[PDB]
Nucleic acid binder design. Structure first.
Lengths: 145, 63, 143, 206, 141, 82, 48
RNA sequence: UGACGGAGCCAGCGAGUCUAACCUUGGCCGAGAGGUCUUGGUAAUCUUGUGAAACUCCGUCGUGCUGGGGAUAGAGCAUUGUAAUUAUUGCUCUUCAACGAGGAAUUCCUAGUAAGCGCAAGUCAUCAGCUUGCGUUGAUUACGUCCCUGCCCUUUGUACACAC
RNA sequence: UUAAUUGCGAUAACGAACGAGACCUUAACCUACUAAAUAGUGGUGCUAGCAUUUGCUGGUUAUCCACUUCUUAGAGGGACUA
C-alpha cells in the first residue's frame, strides 16, 4: 500500500485543539471526539473544506490544519448559515459564537451560575440537583449520589 | 456404543406426571418376536424407526 | 422491441440518469446543497457532498413519470421515514418540503417536468424523451 | 431441433435446466439417499423445491411437518431472539448465503452434509422431569425421531446465533462453519458439545 | 374480439387481477415484465410456475397482472395464484380441457397450494389485550 | 450501585489500518489456497483491520484472481478461479 | 424369552413365587388395595 | 440478523366549519409552524391508492463499551391558549452513567393468532409512551397430563355452617 | 366422546322450564336475479418514448358500445363432518 515513513507523525495518542485524540479512525470522528463539536459540525466542516472523506486520517497538511483553525475562529467569515452554531444570539453581545472544548464548559458554568445568582426556579433546581425540565420525580431520579 | 435399530409397533399411551412422555412398544429387526417397552419424549406414531444405545431395560408401570 | 423505464431495472437506470445529469451539469442547482439532510428525521447527513442531488432529482422525476399529478406534500410523505424519537417509539416523519419544492422548481426550470392542470405537476415531453433516452442507453450498454 | 424463443428475455441456463430435466439451480435432490433409517420419513426427500419460502399450512394437523421441507424448517428457526421475529426475507437471504458457503467448501452434496450434521447433532437420549417425591429427578428417556430432528434444528440455530452475536463474522459464515463442523465431527461446535453434554448427563442419571 | 380471460389471486389484502389473452407470449405486471422486478428471491418465486411448465405454453399468450394491497410477499403470492388460475382458464376456455386438466395435475403434483387460495383471514382483536388472543399482564401485587 | 464487573483488561485488538511490505507480501502470498474469502476471513485469519481488509479485497478483485458468488451487502463471498 | 433361550434345561417349569401380604387398614387404603366405597355398596362381599 | 446515508415505497371498517371553522389541495420563502382564493362539503366522488414501518439493493461504523442514550442540561424559530415560565409539543447543536444469554420469582401465546413493525378513532384550546380497531412477515415443542394454580360431577369423612 | 345434564342409553319416574345449543354480526367461496363520469379495455376529441408490426406506459367526458368475473350492495347458493 501507500508507504509513509515511520516517523513521529504516527503517535499512539496525539494533541488536537487542546484535547487528546487517538487516530486509526476517521478524521471526522476524531473531530467528534473534540468536546463541544460532534458529527454534524465535523462533517459540515470537512465537506465545506472539500477534503475527501474516504481518505484516511494519516496525512494532513499544515495549510489544511490552518484552514480548520480559521473555520472555527470565524465560521461566519466562511459563509456558514449561522443556525448550525451552538450559541445563537448570545446574552453578552448577541453575535454568534462557536465554542471550544473549554469554552463550552465555561459557558455552561457561566449560565448555570447566572441562573443561581438570579435565583430563578431553574437556578434553585440546579442548586438542589433536581430535575428542572418538569420531569416526574416521584419515581425517578433516585440514585442521584 | 452398540446401537440397535427398532420400530414402534404400538403406541401404548401417554404417561408421566405432566404427560410429556409416551409409552410405546418396539420390535427389533433381528430376532423376530422380540419387543421392548420404551418411552418417548416427543411425538411418536405408527411405523416409526428407532435408535437405541442400550436395549436391556423395560418400564412396566408409572404412577 | 419496446424500451421503457418500467421494462428496465430501477437502480441501474437511475444511476445512469444521475451520471448523465452530472456530466451535463446544467440543472441550475439551488446552491445550499451539501448542508441539508434531505429530510428532517435523519440523524446523520448524506455522504457525498457534490452528489445525491442528481439522485434526488432523478428519483422525483421518475416518480412523477410513474404517477400523474403530485405535489410537494406528496413528495415529503413519500420520502419520509421512521424517526428515532429517543425513548418515545418511532413514528413516521415527512421529508424536507423545501428540498422537494426546490427540486420541483429545478425540474421546471430545466423543462424535464412541467405544471399540470387540476393542481400538480407532470413529466414533460422533453423530460420523458431524455428519460427514455437514458434508459435506452442503459439497455444498449448492458446488452 | 429449433430454439423456441420468447421476446421477453429468459436466461439460457435456466431455460436449459427447465427443458432438459427438472432440477434446482446448483444442488441435486437425486442420489442423496441416507442410511439413517431413524430420521428418514421426517426429512423431505424426492420433493425438489424452487425457493425455500412457502406459506404452507403446516401447523394444523399432527405430522404435516413430516412432509414439510427441512430447509424451510431451518430458515424458520433462524427467526428468533426477539427483534428477528418474522423477516422471512432476511432468513432466506442468510440461508441462501449459508448454502452457497457450504457449496463452495466441502464440494460434496450440500443437503447431504446438512442432513449428516442434523443427524449427528440430534440427541437420541434426553432427560425428563420425574417427580420422585420432594426431590424431583431426571429420567433417561430414549426414542423420538421428530424430537431428534427438532432439537438438531434448534441446536444448530441457537449455536449459530450465539456465535454470530457480538463479533465481526456474519451469521451466514458462522452458521456455515457450525454446519460443516457438526457434519464432519470435531467435538468443537457449540450445538454438538451441548448435545453430547446432555447425553452424558442423561447416561449418568440413567 | 381479442379473447381475454379475467382471473384474480387473493391474499390477506393483496388482490391481483390477471388478464390472459392471445398475444405475442408475454407476461407483464403493472406494465413492467414479471422477469425484471429484480427481487432476486421473489423473482424465482414467481418464475416457479413458468419454470415448471416451460415456455411451450406461452408462445402467443399475454398475461397482464395488476396488483393492489398487502405487503411484498402477499403481492407475489397473489400474483402467482392469479397467473396460475389465468393459465388454467385459458387452457380450459380455448386450449383443450385435457390440457387444462394435465396442467392442473402438474401444478398440484409440484404443490397442492398452487391451485387453492389461502384463507387464513386475520383474527380480530379483543379488548383486554394487545392482540387477538394475548392478554396484557396479570400482576397481583 | 454495583459495577457488576472486575475491571480487567479486554482483548485490546491492534487492528492494522496501515501496513508495510513485510505484511503486504505476506497477504499476497497468503491469499491463494483460500477456499472461502470474506471480510471476516481476512480479519480473523490475518489479524488486520476491517478497512484494510475491505480495501485489499477490492484491490484483489479488481486485479482478478477470485470471483464473486454474491454481491449482497454485509456478506461478500469470493472464490479463486483456477 | 431371555431366560428360555439362556436356559440349559429345555421345557423348564419356570416356577412362580407365592406369598401372602397382610395389610393394615391404613396402609391398604393408602396403597389402594381397597378404597372408600359408597355406603350402599360397602355391603358387597363379592370381589370383582 | 444492527445504526445511518441513497433507489423501490403496499389496508380499510376510521374521522371531518351554520349562527360563525374541521381535517389541508398553493404561485413566495425554511428540514419547522404561517398569510392572500377556494379547488371540500353538507361528504364511496375532497383530505386519501392515507405513496404511513423492520421489508429489496451500493457503501460507511465495525468489536475496540462504537455512531444504540437526548437519560441530563444550556443556546433560536414557531400551530394552539388573552398566560405553554418549574423542556405541554416540533426542528437545528453536546457530555457518556447502565448494558458479556439478565438472580429468587412472575405474565401472555393452537393458525396467520406469539412476536416485530406501522396506521385510524377515543380523551383535545395544543402534544400519546395509553386504550379500542386495522394492516405487513410470521411460531418447532400443542389432538397430551393433572405434577403446581384452579375448577365440574360422584363417592366419602367432618366436632365446619360469619362454612378451613 | 369433543365444550357442554351435549347425547346414546339403563332406570320410580313421567312430563316440562331456564342455562348449553338454537340465535344476531364479523372475515373469507359467488364468472347468477339488478348496477354510476368514483376500479378498464379497442376505435376516438388532442400528444410522446420503442418507428412507418398488430402493443404498453401515459394524460381527459357526454362521443357511444359489451361488464362489478377485483372495491360495495338487497327475495339470495353451498358446508351438513359430503
Amino acid at each position: 500500500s501507500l508507504v509513509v515513513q515511520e516517523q513521529g507523525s504516527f503517535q499512539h495518542i496525539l494533541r488536537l485543539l487542546n484535547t487528546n485524540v487517538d487516530g486509526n479512525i476517521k478524521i471526522v470522528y476524531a473531530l467528534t471526539t473534540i468536546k463541544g463539536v460532534g458529527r454534524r459540525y465535523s462533517n459540515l466542516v470537512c465537506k465545506k473544506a472539500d477534503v475527501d472523506l474516504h481518505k484516511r486520517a494519516g496525512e494532513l497538511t499544515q495549510e489544511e490544519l490552518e484552514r480548520i483553525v480559521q473555520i472555527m475562529q470565524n465560521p461566519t467569515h466562511y459563509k456558514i448559515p449561522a443556525w448550525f452554531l451552538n450559541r445563537q444570539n448570545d446574552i453578552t453581545d448577541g453575535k454568534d459564537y462557536h465554542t471550544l472544548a473549554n469554552n463550552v464548559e465555561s459557558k455552561l458554568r457561566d449560565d448555570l451560575e447566572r441562573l443561581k445568582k438570579i435565583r430563578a426556579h431553574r437556578g434553585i433546581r440546579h442548586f438542589w440537583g433536581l430535575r428542572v425540565r418538569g420531569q416526574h420525580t416521584k419515581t425517578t431520579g433516585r440514585r442521584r449520589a | 456404543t452398540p446401537v440397535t435399530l427398532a420400530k414402534v409397533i404400538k403406541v401404548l399411551g401417554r404417561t408421566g406426571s405432566r404427560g410429556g412422555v409416551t409409552q410405546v412398544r418396539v420390535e427389533f429387526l433381528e430376532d423376530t418376536s422380540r419387543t421392548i417397552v420404551r418411552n418417548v419424549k416427543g411425538p411418536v406414531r405408527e411405523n416409526d424407526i428407532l435408535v437405541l444405545m442400550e436395549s436391556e431395560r423395560e418400564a412396566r408401570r408409572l404412577r | 422491441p419496446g424500451v421503457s423505464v418500467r421494462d428496465v431495472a430501477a437502480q441501474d437506470f437511475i444511476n445512469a440518469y444521475a451520471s448523465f445529469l452530472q456530466r451535463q451539469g446544467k440543472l441550475e442547482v439551488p446552491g445550499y446543497v451539501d448542508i441539508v439532510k434531505t429530510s428532517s428525521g435523519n440523524e446523520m447527513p448524506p455522504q457525498d457532498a457534490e452528489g445525491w442531488f442528481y439522485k434526488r432529482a432523478a428519483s422525483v422525476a421518475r416518480h412523477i413519470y410513474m404517477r400523474k399529478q403530485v405535489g410537494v406534500g406528496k413528495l415529503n410523505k413519500l420520502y419520509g421515514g421512521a424517526k428515532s424519537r429517543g425513548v418515545r417509539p418511532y413514528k413516521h416523519i415527512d421529508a424536507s418540503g423545501s428540498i422537494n419544492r426546490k427540486v420541483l422548481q429545478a425540474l421546471e426550470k430545466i423543462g424535464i417536468v412541467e405544471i399540470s392542470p387540476k393542481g400538480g405537476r407532470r413529466i414533460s415531453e422533453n423530460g420523458q424523451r431524455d428519460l427514455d433516452r437514458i434508459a435506452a442507453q442503459t439497455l444498449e450498454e448492458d446488452e | 431441433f429449433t430454439p423456441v424463443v420468447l421476446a421477453t428475455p429468459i436466461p439460457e441456463e435456466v431455460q436449459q435446466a427447465q427443458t432438459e430435466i427438472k432440477l434446482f439451480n446448483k444442488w441435486s435432490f437425486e442420489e442423496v439417499e441416507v442410511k439413517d433409517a431413524s430420521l428418514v420419513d421426517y426429512v423431505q426427500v424426492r420433493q425438489p423445491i424452487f425457493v425455500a419460502h412457502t406459506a404452507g399450512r403446516y401447523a394444523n394437523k399432527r405430522f404435516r411437518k413430516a412432509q414439510c421441507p427441512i430447509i424451510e424448517r431451518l430458515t424458520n428457526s433462524l427467526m428468533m431472539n426477539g427483534r428477528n421475529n418474522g423477516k422471512k426475507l432476511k432468513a432466506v437471504r442468510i440461508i441462501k448465503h449459508t448454502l452457497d458457503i457450504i457449496n463452495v467448501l466441502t464440494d460434496q452434496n450440500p443437503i447431504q452434509v446438512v442432513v449428516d450434521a442434523i443427524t449427528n447433532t440430534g440427541p437420541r437420549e434426553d432427560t425428563t422431569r420425574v417427580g420422585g417425591g420432594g426431590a424431583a429427578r431426571r429420567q433417561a428417556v430414549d426414542v423420538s425421531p421428530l424430537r431428534r430432528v427438532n432439537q438438531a434444528i434448534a441446536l444448530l440455530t441457537i449455536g449459530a446465533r450465539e456465535a454470530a452475536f457480538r463479533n465481526i463474522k456474519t451469521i451466514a459464515e458462522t452458521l456455515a462453519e457450525e454446519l460443516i463442523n457438526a457434519a464432519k465431527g470435531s467435538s468443537t461446535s457449540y450445538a454438538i458439545k451441548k448435545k453430547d453434554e446432555l447425553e452424558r448427563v442423561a447416561k449418568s442419571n440413567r | 374480439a381479442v379473447p381475454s380471460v379475467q382471473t384474480f389471486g387473493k391474499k390477506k389484502s393483496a388482490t391481483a387481477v390477471a388478464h390472459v389473452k392471445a398475444g405475442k407470449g408475454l407476461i407483464k405486471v403493472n406494465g413492467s415484465p414479471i422477469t425484471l422486478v429484480e427481487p432476486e428471491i421473489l423473482r424465482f418465486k414467481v418464475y416457479e410456475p413458468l419454470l415448471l411448465v416451460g415456455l411451450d405454453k406461452f408462445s402467443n399468450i399475454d398475461i397482464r397482472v395488476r396488483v393492489t394491497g398487502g405487503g411484498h410477499v402477499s403481492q407475489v403470492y397473489a400474483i402467482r395464484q392469479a397467473i396460475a388460475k389465468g393459465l388454467v382458464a385459458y387452457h380450459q376456455k380455448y386450449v383443450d380441457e385435457q390440457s387444462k386438466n394435465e396442467l392442473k395435475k402438474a401444478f398440484t403434483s409440484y404443490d397442492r397450494t398452487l391451485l387453492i387460495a389461502d384463507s387464513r383471514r386475520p383474527e380480530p382483536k379483543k379488548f383486554g389485550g394487545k392482540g387477538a388472543r394475548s392478554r396484557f399482564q396479570k400482576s397481583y401485587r | 450501585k454495583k459495577k457488576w464487573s472486575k475491571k480487567s483488561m479486554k482483548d485490546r485488538a491492534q487492528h492494522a489500518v496501515i501496513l508495510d511490505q513485510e505484511k503486504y507480501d505476506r497477504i499476497l502470498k497468503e491469499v491463494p489456497t483460500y477456499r472461502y474469502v470474506s471480510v471476516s476471513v481476512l480479519v480473523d485469519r490475518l489479524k488486520i483491520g476491517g478497512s484494510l481488509a475491505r480495501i485489499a479485497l477490492r484491490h484483489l478483485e479488481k486485479e482478478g484472481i477470485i470471483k464473486p458468488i454474491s454481491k449482497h451487502s454485509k456478506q461478500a463471498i469470493y472464490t479463486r478461479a483456477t | 424369552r431371555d431366560l428360555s433361550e439362556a436356559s440349559v434345561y429345555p421345557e423348564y417349569a419356570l416356577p412362580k413365587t407365592y406369598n401372602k401380604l397382610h395389610y393394615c387398614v391404613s396402609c391398604a387404603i393408602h396403597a389402594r388395595i381397597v378404597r372408600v366405597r359408597s355406603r350402599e355398596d360397602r355391603k358387597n362381599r363379592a370381589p370383582p
